[PDB]
Amino acid sequence: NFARKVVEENKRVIVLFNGLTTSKLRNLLELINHVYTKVYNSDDTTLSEDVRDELEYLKVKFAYESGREPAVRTFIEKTYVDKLVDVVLKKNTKKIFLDYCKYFEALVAYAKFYR
Amino acid sequence: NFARKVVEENKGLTTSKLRNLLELINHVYTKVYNSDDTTLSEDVRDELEYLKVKFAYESGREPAVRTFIEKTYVDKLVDVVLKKNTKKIFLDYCKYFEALVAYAKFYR
Amino acid sequence: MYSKIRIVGKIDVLTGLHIGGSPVVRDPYSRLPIIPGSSIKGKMRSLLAKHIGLIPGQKMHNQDAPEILRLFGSSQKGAIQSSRLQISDAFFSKASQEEFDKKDLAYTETKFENTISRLTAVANPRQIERVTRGASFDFHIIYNVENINEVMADFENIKTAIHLLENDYLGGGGTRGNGRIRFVIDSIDTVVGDFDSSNLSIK
Amino acid sequence: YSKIRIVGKIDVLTGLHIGGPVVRDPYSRLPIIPGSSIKGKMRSLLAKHIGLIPGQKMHNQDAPEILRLFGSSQKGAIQSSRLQISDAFFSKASQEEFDKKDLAYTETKFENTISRLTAVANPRQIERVTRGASFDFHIIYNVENINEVMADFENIKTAIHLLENDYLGGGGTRGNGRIRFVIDSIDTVVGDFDSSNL
Amino acid sequence: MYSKIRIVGKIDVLTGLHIGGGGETSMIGAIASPVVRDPYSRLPIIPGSSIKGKMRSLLAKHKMHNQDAPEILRLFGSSQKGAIQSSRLQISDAFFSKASQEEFDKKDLAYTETKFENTISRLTAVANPRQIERVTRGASFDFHIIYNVENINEVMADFENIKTAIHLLENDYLGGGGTRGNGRIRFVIDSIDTVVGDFDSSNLSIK
RNA sequence: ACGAGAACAUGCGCGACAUUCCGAAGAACG
RNA sequence: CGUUCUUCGGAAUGUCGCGCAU
């Protein structure tokens, strides 16, 4: 889908997203994995308040990691990850967040695949 | 919260002073971690009272710190933690301070 | 008159309990950790079989002592014995669920570990998911009274197995700290039959 | 088949660091010494005390005493472990001693990391348990050969003597984690084994 | 035989020793340079990290740390990828000795004293006050290090290097600053024994 | 007065063994 | 008074992966 297109567009000779690796993404992907587990536990059509706050914190973490790492900033701007966080936050639905997590999972999967 | 809009609108406030003030929040944060109470602790209350005293002297030390405090309403949020008397609200305030430090780093 | 003695209680994990399946085994409908009943049954059977004694050069689980084969079951050709013990899956208790919802605990922990290879003096990171220490699982076992005369010896063997299991661990990396558990028996009554189990106890 | 319990205390002579920010028991937020940390450190120290063959990549080719005590996974020679080290939790006595004083369970240590060729410091902030905090440790030993119980407890004593003089995790090289062992009672919790001489 | 040689001795500070540590202090006054203090007994301590780092840097003088000399790379350890080496020196925190604590309790001498300094620019001639917490000159710290005997032949050379390093630490400063004269230190040896193994350290000494 | 009638895909079996969150790192500068 | 304000590696690995009754 979109994830395959962006990973193919960002591939370079193998250099992905200006030198992005799984180790650089590991902190954020672990945070997003924590977010997912809380959503998996939740049984409510609407996102909780706590998950909304920590998704805002995930947005803050995206900004911080992008500021520290040029590769993560390139990944965020090319893959629209932060904007998608804002989109799911304003939509406030569990299924949309699960779709966004699926999108990130596809991103990392194809990144490893072309690695 | 609204850290992004304020930090973008206001973009000699140096990251050094922010990091010192963040360290003072860190010290209160360790205390609230040791507290482990839903209600606001009295020792934590003393910690945040001396924190606002330290906010005042900082303002006296550097005008740039004062502009940051008045524009970000950190002192007003401290008043909010007192007028609410909970630990969840304090943890929210600590995150907001951290967000201001992060956004400041990002826009820098 | 068929006699079934229901023994209900709790398993309090004195240390992190990791029954794999590194995700723990979870009940998909509730997505909460459980103790598989086969884990309790296998650990109890192994401990009690070692305590009673292992037939030298043993190969199968139908060669244990007749005490073990009666209570834990036998599938030997011709000599098939029904299993007295029916150890159900132990589900995460509601009380510990509330106590974990307070303090915002996750009901699980991801213990970080490593192994230092002798040749390289290098460490290989490893994450093991464990149930937190506070958790308690409500366990429910059923005893079938095939022989009324053997109930007392069987409950002595059950007590021995439980006592060994408390000083041992439930499934996981026990030798490295995981899996320590403690049984707290809440009730022992005959759900079915005229049997008088009021004089019985396993812990 | 008897089980003998070795319950006692571990008191930190210096700050104890075991990464996970020290690892804490989530239920009570108190720092703990993982049983795996003690087991690994004792096994490594004892295997160093006994000879080591030049190549032990498999981690299972080692002295037969080590394999008998701590367990083995060699295919066709799977030996069950007799030692079962368990997480040392924060002792209630030490908890109340720290609660009476205005003292935190952990501390933060600040270190410079001065890169000598560039003469620039890179500060780091470590959390480590303050000295004087005690963790109650609990071990179970399963006797399998009554003939080898004396040798196995000799090896356990040697390992504990090594560990008491060594560190337990963290920058022990920089001086974090030195501990002392105080064994209280060694009694056979299951079986007819006698533990008077242990 | 994995022999371990324990060295226990005293460290007496000839000048105020300042070793900083971040944190919060109740009723924190104008002073903003508090010396590192052991939380349990509220006494100044020297972190084994400081001693190890100072001795290693002095020995290296005499891009990364791992590129140093093999002797420095063996005593104090290594982390080169693939060629990871264990560390034979394990320096621990030198806590406040009971003898010095009693000597201070006699006369009620303060453990740590606050010193006033300033830096002035000639063009403006305006001073900036500074208050620094320095451990008083009479204090002594009991240090305890462990040398792991992994190679039998190299122990004598390692202890010669440690003795040189101990002399370098004495000659040079520790903690706050040499140009200021803060942190002068002296090392006296109480007992050097091979606590573990068949090794003997009757002739082995670090001074 | 149904190619029909009566007949548990059931019995036994621990997701387990080996595993150090560790290797190095001065709160330092004039 | 200011400076850096944690960073550099390893992130699981090896095995069993159905067997025994009808």
Side-chain angles (χ1 to χ4, degrees):
Chain A
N1 53 20
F2 184 52
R4 236 198 66 173
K5 177 180 179 299
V6 299
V7 177
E8 177 85 17
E9 181 259 9
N10 285 114
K11 72 191 295 182
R12 192 182 309 168
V13 59
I14 281 83
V15 170
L16 291 170
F17 302 93
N18 292 77
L20 177 58
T21 62
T22 170
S23 182
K24 302 183 180 63
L25 294 181
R26 83 101 197 176
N27 165 244
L28 293 170
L29 67 87
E30 284 191 0
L31 218 55
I32 302 180
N33 153 252
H34 175 234
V35 183
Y36 163 84
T37 56
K38 305 163 55 154
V39 145
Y40 199 160
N41 299 358
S42 71
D43 287 359
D44 199 331
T45 175
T46 171
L47 294 195
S48 176
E49 318 87 316
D50 178 75
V51 307
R52 200 189 76 260
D53 310 333
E54 55 80 17
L55 272 182
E56 294 278 5
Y57 177 67
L58 173 67
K59 185 181 310 179
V60 178
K61 284 294 299 185
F62 280 143
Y64 171 62
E65 298 286 353
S66 59
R68 289 208 305 182
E69 279 300 323
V72 185
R73 191 191 304 102
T74 312
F75 184 82
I76 294 299
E77 66 171 352
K78 263 76 178 59
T79 56
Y80 288 76
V81 163
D82 191 88
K83 321 301 167 300
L84 280 174
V85 175
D86 203 326
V87 158
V88 58
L89 278 169
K90 61 160 297 180
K91 292 199 63 172
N92 196 305
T93 324
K94 269 191 59 176
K95 55 178 300 298
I96 312 300
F97 164 73
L98 295 179
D99 197 356
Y100 162 68
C101 269
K102 290 167 167 71
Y103 171 74
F104 185 85
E105 180 183 357
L107 279 184
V108 49
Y110 300 144
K112 276 187 185 175
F113 194 89
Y114 294 105
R115 205 73 56 83
Chain B
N1 222 294
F2 60 94
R4 190 179 190 91
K5 57 170 295 177
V6 294
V7 75
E8 184 178 2
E9 291 157 7
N10 291 88
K11 172 176 56 61
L13 187 276
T14 316
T15 176
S16 307
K17 322 296 293 183
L18 287 182
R19 211 195 170 278
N20 293 133
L21 292 173
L22 193 60
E23 290 329 296
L24 305 178
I25 310 292
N26 289 304
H27 304 143
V28 200
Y29 207 32
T30 63
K31 298 315 170 61
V32 305
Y33 275 168
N34 283 119
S35 66
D36 295 320
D37 49 356
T38 169
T39 66
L40 220 164
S41 173
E42 43 89 11
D43 176 63
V44 170
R45 175 160 289 101
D46 311 327
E47 287 281 8
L48 48 81
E49 288 289 343
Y50 190 71
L51 184 64
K52 82 178 62 180
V53 170
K54 269 299 178 185
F55 287 171
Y57 209 94
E58 259 285 0
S59 299
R61 279 184 280 258
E62 171 65 23
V65 178
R66 169 171 44 240
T67 59
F68 160 80
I69 289 179
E70 67 185 11
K71 283 301 179 300
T72 58
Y73 300 84
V74 285
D75 198 317
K76 319 309 297 174
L77 292 183
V78 171
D79 303 353
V80 163
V81 183
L82 282 181
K83 79 190 52 168
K84 184 56 178 61
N85 194 89
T86 35
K87 202 173 103 63
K88 162 176 55 182
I89 273 69
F90 176 78
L91 266 57
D92 298 310
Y93 163 81
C94 168
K95 286 185 294 289
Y96 179 86
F97 205 91
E98 174 199 2
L100 295 167
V101 173
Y103 284 151
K105 289 292 301 171
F106 177 56
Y107 289 105
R108 174 176 285 96
Chain C
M1 200 69 175
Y2 203 28
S3 166
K4 308 184 81 66
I5 311 168
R6 173 183 59 176
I7 309 167
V8 295
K10 291 188 174 300
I11 304 172
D12 310 349
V13 287
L14 262 46
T15 323
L17 174 73
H18 168 56
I19 299 171
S22 308
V24 296
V25 50
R26 291 175 172 273
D27 165 42
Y29 186 68
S30 285
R31 201 37 64 167
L32 288 177
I34 63 170
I35 298 178
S38 52
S39 276
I40 327 174
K41 187 149 188 281
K43 200 35 156 291
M44 288 174 46
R45 168 154 181 162
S46 168
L47 292 179
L48 188 58
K50 268 183 191 172
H51 174 257
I52 299 280
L54 281 190
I55 304 303
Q58 191 164 0
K59 278 82 181 180
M60 304 174 307
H61 300 253
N62 304 126
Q63 299 175 358
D64 296 349
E67 293 287 349
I68 311 307
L69 258 57
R70 73 194 194 179
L71 282 135
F72 291 97
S74 172
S75 88
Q76 178 66 18
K77 290 176 49 58
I80 272 184
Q81 307 185 237
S82 65
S83 181
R84 309 268 190 94
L85 273 185
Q86 305 180 190
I87 310 264
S88 61
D89 291 337
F91 303 119
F92 205 105
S93 47
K94 178 165 298 180
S96 300
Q97 187 162 356
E98 305 169 340
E99 295 179 3
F100 271 55
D101 278 354
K102 305 179 192 171
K103 300 174 260 57
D104 301 326
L105 285 181
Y107 312 101
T108 203
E109 62 189 64
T110 314
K111 179 168 180 274
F112 276 77
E113 316 188 6
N114 77 71
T115 297
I116 312 198
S117 70
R118 319 273 203 180
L119 81 151
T120 327
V122 76
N124 183 258
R126 162 190 59 240
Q127 299 186 30
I128 280 183
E129 179 170 348
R130 312 195 317 187
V131 183
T132 317
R133 176 176 58 87
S136 82
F137 306 93
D138 186 64
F139 85 93
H140 153 275
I141 86 186
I142 290 275
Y143 181 93
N144 306 324
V145 174
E146 319 278 1
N147 200 342
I148 303 183
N149 309 330
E150 305 176 27
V151 180
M152 299 306 175
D154 281 9
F155 270 80
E156 284 279 355
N157 295 139
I158 295 183
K159 161 188 292 292
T160 295
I162 295 293
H163 190 259
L164 291 151
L165 181 52
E166 291 188 351
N167 297 266
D168 213 43
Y169 61 92
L170 212 26
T175 68
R176 285 170 302 268
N178 302 3
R180 288 255 319 286
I181 43 83
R182 187 173 44 83
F183 284 70
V184 200
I185 268 62
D186 282 336
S187 175
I188 298 190
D189 54 332
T190 54
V191 163
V192 195
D194 63 333
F195 193 75
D196 182 21
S197 70
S198 48
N199 301 19
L200 306 188
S201 61
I202 68 186
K203 191 264 178 173
Chain D
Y1 178 72
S2 317
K3 331 186 66 64
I4 317 170
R5 90 191 311 171
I6 312 172
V7 59
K9 297 178 64 63
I10 302 174
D11 40 24
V12 286
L13 299 187
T14 66
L16 192 88
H17 184 48
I18 298 179
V22 283
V23 49
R24 335 174 80 87
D25 163 49
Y27 190 74
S28 65
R29 291 100 159 82
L30 295 164
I32 64 172
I33 308 188
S36 54
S37 280
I38 315 175
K39 171 114 177 299
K41 203 54 184 172
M42 291 199 317
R43 176 164 186 166
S44 172
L45 287 177
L46 189 47
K48 213 63 175 183
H49 180 241
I50 317 180
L52 288 182
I53 47 183
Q56 306 205 356
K57 315 163 295 300
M58 311 148 41
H59 206 310
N60 296 266
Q61 41 178 176
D62 198 324
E65 298 82 357
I66 284 297
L67 276 67
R68 177 208 323 178
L69 250 183
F70 301 94
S72 174
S73 180
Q74 186 75 294
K75 203 194 72 175
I78 291 188
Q79 313 197 35
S80 306
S81 181
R82 295 183 194 172
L83 274 193
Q84 294 182 0
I85 318 297
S86 184
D87 296 6
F89 305 107
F90 210 78
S91 179
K92 183 175 183 56
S94 191
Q95 180 174 1
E96 303 302 334
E97 172 175 18
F98 277 16
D99 276 351
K100 290 197 310 301
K101 318 167 62 58
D102 180 70
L103 192 52
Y105 302 142
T106 61
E107 81 204 24
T108 71
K109 184 184 173 186
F110 289 73
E111 190 166 350
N112 248 348
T113 320
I114 292 183
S115 55
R116 57 190 54 105
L117 298 96
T118 321
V120 172
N122 173 259
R124 64 200 203 101
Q125 171 166 340
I126 300 180
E127 182 180 3
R128 41 175 261 185
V129 177
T130 77
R131 87 148 167 85
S134 67
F135 306 87
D136 38 10
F137 85 95
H138 165 290
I139 305 182
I140 281 275
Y141 179 85
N142 316 270
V143 301
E144 295 168 325
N145 303 138
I146 312 293
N147 315 271
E148 304 163 10
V149 177
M150 171 67 74
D152 282 358
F153 268 76
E154 156 76 10
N155 281 141
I156 283 174
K157 181 215 311 176
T158 288
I160 274 187
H161 171 89
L162 283 169
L163 183 54
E164 184 182 343
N165 300 24
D166 215 63
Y167 59 91
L168 191 56
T173 309
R174 270 70 63 179
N176 295 334
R178 289 182 55 256
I179 55 178
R180 164 160 37 81
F181 284 84
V182 183
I183 302 98
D184 290 47
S185 72
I186 303 187
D187 58 329
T188 64
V189 54
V190 192
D192 57 6
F193 203 96
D194 64 323
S195 56
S196 300
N197 68 95
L198 307 169
Chain E
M1 296 297 292
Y2 165 62
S3 300
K4 292 167 73 181
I5 316 179
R6 174 192 286 176
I7 304 173
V8 172
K10 300 178 304 305
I11 287 169
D12 37 356
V13 283
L14 275 303
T15 59
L17 176 87
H18 168 59
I19 295 182
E24 54 93 16
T25 301
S26 60
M27 309 166 269
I28 166 184
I31 173 179
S33 291
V35 72
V36 61
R37 303 160 77 85
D38 180 287
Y40 184 58
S41 67
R42 292 285 187 267
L43 301 184
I45 56 105
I46 304 183
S49 315
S50 301
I51 296 292
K52 188 139 192 294
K54 276 301 300 183
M55 290 203 320
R56 175 166 189 177
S57 70
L58 282 174
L59 197 52
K61 267 67 171 184
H62 175 271
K63 183 182 65 67
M64 292 183 57
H65 312 272
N66 299 1
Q67 56 92 21
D68 284 351
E71 302 297 83
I72 315 167
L73 202 64
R74 181 177 68 256
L75 269 171
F76 304 88
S78 171
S79 158
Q80 222 295 298
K81 184 160 189 164
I84 295 187
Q85 315 178 15
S86 297
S87 46
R88 294 181 187 178
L89 259 189
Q90 302 181 10
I91 311 179
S92 186
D93 305 356
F95 296 87
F96 208 96
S97 61
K98 281 290 300 183
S100 299
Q101 183 167 355
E102 286 188 5
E103 286 192 3
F104 285 160
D105 280 4
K106 178 179 55 182
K107 297 102 56 184
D108 289 334
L109 220 55
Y111 301 138
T112 79
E113 49 91 15
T114 295
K115 192 174 180 304
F116 290 79
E117 291 173 5
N118 55 5
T119 52
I120 294 184
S121 65
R122 310 95 176 94
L123 67 154
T124 57
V126 52
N128 190 11
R130 199 140 197 84
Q131 311 184 181
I132 52 176
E133 207 191 6
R134 286 159 65 247
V135 182
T136 40
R137 187 177 57 76
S140 63
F141 301 99
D142 293 322
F143 87 105
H144 157 277
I145 83 183
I146 289 290
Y147 180 79
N148 303 124
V149 178
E150 296 162 14
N151 185 285
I152 322 101
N153 305 326
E154 299 163 355
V155 175
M156 40 184 179
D158 277 358
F159 264 61
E160 297 287 351
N161 297 17
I162 297 174
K163 174 174 57 185
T164 301
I166 283 297
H167 175 221
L168 293 169
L169 193 45
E170 291 159 357
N171 160 272
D172 204 65
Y173 73 96
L174 167 68
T179 67
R180 323 296 168 61
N182 303 0
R184 296 309 186 245
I185 165 183
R186 178 198 294 122
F187 267 90
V188 288
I189 279 75
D190 296 10
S191 61
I192 304 178
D193 59 326
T194 70
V195 284
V196 178
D198 68 323
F199 218 98
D200 189 2
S201 53
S202 61
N203 186 268
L204 285 72
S205 67
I206 62 176
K207 188 171 181 179

